[PDB]
Design a protein around this ligand. Structure first.
Ligand SMILES: Nc1nc2c(ncn2[C@@H]2O[C@H](COP(=O)(O)OP(=O)(O)O)[C@@H](O)[C@H]2O)c(=O)[nH]1
Ligand SMILES: Nc1nc2c(ncn2[C@@H]2O[C@H](COP(=O)(O)OP(=O)(O)O)[C@@H](O)[C@H]2O)c(=O)[nH]1
Ligand SMILES: Nc1nc2c(ncn2[C@@H]2O[C@H](COP(=O)(O)OP(=O)(O)O)[C@@H](O)[C@H]2O)c(=O)[nH]1
Lengths: 430, 25, 426, 430, 25
């Protein structure tokens, strides 16, 4: 059947994907030994979409781990779920990227990409029907950014008809964690906009806001943010694994959600989100999930969507629900807030319903929005990048890896053109 | 340096196909 | 994975590195015999970063000791942890430097640097993945300054793609320890600015001020100042040895912290610092660490950073913390004091979090700041050097060995150009 | 029935064959006493192909040990399985070869070959149906090279209609172990190309690469390399001993694999190969064995086969399998990589399936490839040999044994002609 | 000093053997 090759790259890649595989193994009843010990047939009905079965009731997650320094991989291998992963797919270098995109893309990635692609081909030839590739990585991180751009280019050349999905951690609007993050982000998007099919933008700052505000958490960790991101990832591909009243694979989402080839970035969201104490005072209904999804404070992206308009909206629900209820809620949303949707797209909302709810919830819903408001992210990145580039800030660190001024110039020009395209598609024109 | 791809679309002059008036005479 | 070769030159460097290796051996549970007797797997997980494993459950610190006079090395061998170093790497001469940089760089260094480099090559060939070289030395000491400049040039020529990190003791603004400190400091900088990747400027004056005002120490010794410097050194590379929520190795530090290749001198800091009695009166939080770090009185370099602007800030934290807490503190710092950072660099602070705190603390943080205010230090050095050089003060001692007036003139020109560059970017 | 006379010569001969007889005695349930203590009738059904039965339930391996110094033979006799071998067949000299092919071929071999051939005739007359001779030896070793060339010539004259198979250890591309190895190898092949039927090229360096890379071994020994070579040897002649769905004797392999009389060298391979830890994460299927066999890193020869093309491919499988599965995998291999096969040979792959798997495995497969890429080995040997011969490097050590310059000249000319023939058969011509 | 043994092979003119047209007249 359809199979997904999950590629992990960078620190975000490794950590987020470790939490992701924890969640996925929990959903399918796979204990840390790889042996199936679940309680339902649907867990094994579509176990092959993310797992390879080695005879002996052991299942191996079809994942590839990529990094340039073995520290994060050692931490992953020694932690929980270390022995389920077949050790063939721990492909790492020795130098590290040093947060330099130029380094990770032209020297260290250039040295390691042959082994990584051989592993990719090994995992792809063993598949029954390769559906798409999922990449978890950060943009500010040099390893993540560079290795991901290189791998995406090479794999797009290798399989031009497969789905290339990426979950990227984007720069924060206030608190940056890397000095050279703007250049890495610019040079990364300069290739992501060309080779990827769709990219989900995750900001750590929005996750912190959700954690302190909604969940009432006082000591949130990167692991809990990874838990939220992993819940989103599991909600995205719930139709590839369990039946439902209305299913939607990855290609259906790509078709319904990308109106024009370059405007493929999406803002993910999740519902329901409650603190532990407040769980006893709020009922779980479809209107509740709908109101939590279409809320500015519940957007995991670093932008208030009320500043622009939406082009496409995807809402995948989980758990037993009424389709009439969901459709009426979507009608109410589109009617009451019609000014937030582009006039040239009638029927802005795409829906899907899976019959299997997440662990511990009666019902949930995953939000995916394509809003012109995301132009704020790209405009801020362009402004910061231009201000830094005028003074040649840290430019020698990248020119020493083989880059010239023309590559930065072309990246910045393409970024300005992308921002201008998003601004162009805010005109009603009718 | 881009411009939205807007086209002037029109179904200018479309005639019917069923000859509902062919035997009106 | 990555490894570090620790080089230890001069009397100052030897003492600082002895204290540093004491601290490192304590962090990894290694007794003075070399046999591992720790209590956690993480102590052995990355013990290779600083130690070679000599079969027999014993580990040898990958350290190289350099000097022109054998007294300091005798004291090191006879003192505690003196047997922890394999005696192969005690490379010393007999003449001594006499605080003459010309001597230690052109004659005695020229005689001893070949053996020094042979030991360096032997230690580097044993490495699986060499990451960077560390040099602990003072700028005033003839041995320190001369051997450091010469050896850094040689190693940079041999390994052009490795990281050259130095922890230098800089001259004090009030009290000089050597009469000819200006010539040595100027001629040392004239090569450090060309061959090194980054240099941490620690002044003993600021260390005295901190240990007196903050730690309330009444009889501080070189051992206590070296303890502070060693805590800073360990916090610098804690990410190369222990896991964490956000790790940053030497290459990311060098990339984030050096905006332009010549502006690579930094002012280190440390937190928390408390007297013994006051420990029971102040809670240890991330806001407290952030408040202590971004304070002029806690800067170990004798230069008020409020007289200039920061190019970039590195803040590596140790211990269990909330990522949102550190992020909010850094945002508040950048927002409330935006007037002290250059307008052409947004997001001035790069951070990292290690999950292993220093022994005895719930959490800590190491400060590394690239402030344009260090032009004060360099201008003071240039002015004093000019005042001495205009009258040929002590010049004959340097000229007799082989130096000419052209070398001093070029060194002064380079120093003034560096000062002018810092002034340009402020 | 069909019988195989195993001749051991040289250090490679003695060690590799000691490990080989260990493996063979394990497969047939023969304990170190020679008494049969197995558990299946098929162990004794074809026990006579490698064993002679002396009444008393004792079986003697039909092996002949040849050397020029008694040290290696003493080590073999005093080690495991020392008492099963009938002591009649320990035929050794006293001087040793000193790695000089000229010595071992014209003086010491000339003195010992009469006794060795008398032993060969004794073992051959006792046979029921002599099928072929298998020789284990090295090329760089003077004893191995010289004694093997002499014995092969004499036995080919004695039995011109029997199968002459040799398993030769070839020089390594980077790390040579003998100063005079190139001359020994040139003078050895100058006779092997004339008298042998087929030669399997084993490089110790490729075995080291496989050991450190695939098996994740940190301290590999010559004995473990001999274990790999012995597994290959046992897989080669599994059809001479156990039944199966499709059997193939040695003459069938010689016919199907040697297109032209001089191009008889083959590159052996083996599958599956896994580290101990990775065994729990990979299933054993026919596609897995097929992908491991047709892999450049799994070739035990010192050459990347992707530089040339294949002429004939032999793939002998062991264990219960589906013939449809194997045939479909072979079709996929030939179709996806058609550019690596000569156009003038349709149906490049020969197959065979034995129903008895190796000890401890569900299924396995032995690879035998005849690729033009092996011209790299012979070209490097010719280049090194020419460079050494221009300066008369170590030439007196061979001229003192009776050799003249004309013999070296003829050997080098024949080597150049063999390289030119391999290059000629890379032309598609159609 | 060798050359591949390539021959010019052709089934030039081969006629049928079954007289399927012998009684066509
Ligand atoms: N959500 C999340 N973000 C992370 C995590 N670890 C690091 N990041 C973000 O990733 C960025 C660091 O880049 P990184 O990938 O670690 O550096 P690289 O080695 O060059 O790839 C920072 O901006 C962090 O905010 C994590 O566990 N979860
Ligand atoms: N931080 C620190 N500085 C020192 C120490 N010992 C000496 N110094 C400084 O080094 C300078 C003396 O130079 P020194 O290295 O002893 O002379 P050298 O033998 O020629 O290298 C003085 O300015 C001291 O302040 C020490 O243990 N720690
Ligand atoms: N695979 C393998 N190769 C060996 C072994 N022993 C020796 N060799 C190889 O054989 C060569 C030595 O030649 P050798 O036969 O010992 O010398 P000889 O006495 O003249 O025949 C070296 O290149 C070794 O790499 C072994 O046990 N296994």
């Amino acid at each position: 059947m359809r199979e997904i090759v999950h590629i992990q790259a960078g620190q975000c890649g490794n950590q987020i994907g470790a939490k992701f595989w924890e969640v996925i193994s929990d959903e399918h009843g796979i204990d840390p030994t790889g042996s199936y010990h679940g309680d339902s047939d649907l867990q094994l009905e579509r176990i092959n979409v993310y797992y390879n079965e080695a005879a002996g009731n052991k299942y191996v997650p079809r994942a590839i781990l990529v990094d340039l320094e073995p520290g994060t991989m050692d931490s992953v291998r020694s932690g929980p779920f270390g022995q389920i992963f077949r050790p063939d797919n721990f492909v790492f270098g020795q130098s590290g990227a040093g947060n330099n995109w130029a380094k990770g893309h032209y020297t260290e990635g250039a040295e390691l990409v042959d082994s990584v692609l051989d592993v990719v081909r090994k995992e792809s030839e063993s598949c029954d029907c390769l559906q798409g590739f999922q990449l978890t990585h950060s943009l500010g991180g040099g390893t993540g950014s560079g290795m991901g751009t290189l791998l995406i280019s090479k794999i797009r050349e290798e399989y031009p008809d497969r789905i290339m999905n990426t979950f990227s951690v984007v720069p924060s609007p206030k608190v940056s964690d890397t000095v050279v993050e703007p250049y890495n982000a610019t040079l990364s998007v300069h290739q992501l906009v060309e080779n990827t099919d769709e990219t989900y933008c995750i900001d750590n700052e929005a996750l912190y806001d959700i954690c302190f505000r909604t969940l009432k958490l006082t000591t949130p960790t990167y692991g809990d943010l990874n838990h939220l991101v992993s819940a989103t990832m599991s909600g995205v591909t719930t139709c590839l694994r369990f039946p439902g009243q209305l299913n939607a694979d990855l290609r259906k989402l790509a078709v319904n959600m990308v109106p024009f080839p370059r405007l493929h970035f999406f803002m993910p969201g999740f519902a329901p989100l409650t603190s532990r104490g407040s769980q006893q005072y709020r009922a779980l209904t479809v209107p509740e999930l709908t109101q939590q999804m279409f809320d500015a404070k519940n957007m995991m992206a670093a932008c208030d969507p009320r500043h622009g308009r939406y082009l496409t909206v995807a809402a995948v629900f989980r758990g037993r629900m009424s389709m009439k209820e969901v459709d009426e809620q979507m009608l109410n949303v589109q009617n009451k807030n019609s000014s937030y949707f582009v006039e040239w797209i009638p029927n802005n909302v795409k829906t899907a319903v899976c019959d299997i709810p997440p662990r511990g919830l009666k019902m949930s819903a995953t939000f995916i929005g394509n809003s012109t408001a995301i132009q704020e992210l790209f405009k801020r990145i362009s402004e910061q990048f231009t201000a830094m580039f005028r003074r040649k800030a840290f430019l020698h660190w990248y020119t020493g890896e083989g880059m010239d001024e023309m590559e930065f110039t072309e990246a910045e020009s393409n970024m300005n053109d992308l921002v201008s395209e998003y601004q162009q598609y805010q005109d009603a024109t009718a | 340096k881009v411009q939205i791809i807007n086209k002037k679309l029109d179904l200018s002059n479309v005639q019917s196909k069923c000859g509902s008036k062919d035997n009106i005479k």
